[PDB]
Amino acid sequence: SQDLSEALKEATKEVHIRAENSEFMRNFQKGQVSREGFKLVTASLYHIYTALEEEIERNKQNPVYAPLYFPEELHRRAALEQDLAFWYGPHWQEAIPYTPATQHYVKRLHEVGGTHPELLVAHAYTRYLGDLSGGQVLKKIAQKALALPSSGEGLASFTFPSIDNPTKFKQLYRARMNTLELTPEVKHRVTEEAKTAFLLNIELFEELQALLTE
């Protein structure tokens, strides 16, 4: 479509359905998630967000990204560290895995943030708006399926205390995205990089599912 936010939604509709149909997610939605599986994804995401937010800080002043800088509201690295500490203990840093698919994703995140800053939006969009959407549904399912503390320990990465209303916040995020100045061509490169982003997540779920099956 014309507005970037609409073009992104249109461009990733197919890979989104594919992400929901991935074995790992299908099971998660139906309440079939294990402590081992949840630990795995959380660990993998700690790396992805670490790399992602490291690149964001690098371009927080770059006009091609500046409008999407929301450290207090969205940044997930700290929350993920809290979950990892809960699941793996004080020495989580050294106990957590770093799978091939996660590294491949982290790599892409450094390339983009490093030399293609105008595409970082595609990656932030894919992870953050997803956390505020499907993530909100999954959060509730996980607390039940994993019989977690009613206080929220273990699910801090799904919690955005600095956001009163995710739905409302996403509309504001879309507004900001449509504020970005870029040619139709670069805009296409953006929607195209968001598919790549979903594909990196898909590949990551397929790998973890493969790792878990045993």
Residues that bind ligand HEM (CB under 6 A): 8-9, 16, 19-20, 25, 28-29, 125-126, 129-130, 133-134, 137-138, 198, 201
Is 125 among the annotated ligand-binding positions? yes
In 3D, which of 129, 131, 112 has the Cα closest to residue 192? 112
Which of 95/210 has CB closer to ligand HEM?
210
The answer to whether 49 and 76 have CB atoms below 8 angstroms apart is yes
Is 189 among the annotated ligand-binding positions? no
Compute the least distance from the CB of residue 62 to ligand HEM, in Å.
22
Which of 110/139 has CB closer to ligand HEM?
139
* CA–CA gap between residue 201 and residue 206 (Å, rounded): 9
Q: Which residue has the tokens 């509709």?
A: 13
Which of 120/129 has CB closer to ligand HEM?
129
Which of 30/93 has CB closer to ligand HEM?
30
* CA–CA gap between residue 14 and residue 136 (Å, rounded): 21
* CA–CA gap between residue 111 and residue 55 (Å, rounded): 9
Is 9 among the annotated ligand-binding positions? yes
**In the bound complex, which residue of the shown chain has the CB atom lying closest to ligand HEM?**
134
Compute the least distance from the CB of residue 9 to ligand HEM, in Å.
3
Compute the least distance from the CB of residue 72 to ligand HEM, in Å.
21
Which amino acid appears at position 188 of this protein?
Answer: H
Compute the least distance from the CB of residue 1 to ligand HEM, in Å.
11
In 3D, which of 204, 21, 179 has the Cα closest to residue 109? 204
* CA–CA gap between residue 143 and residue 135 (Å, rounded): 12
Phi (first) and psi of residue 150, to 5 degrees: -60, -15
Is 116 among the annotated ligand-binding positions? no
Which of 85/148 has CB closer to ligand HEM?
148
**CA-based torsion, 1, 20, 99, 147: positive or negative:** positive
Compute the least distance from the CB of residue 3 to ligand HEM, in Å.
11
Annotated binding site for heme b: 9, 16, 125, 174
Annotated binding site: 9, 16, 125, 174
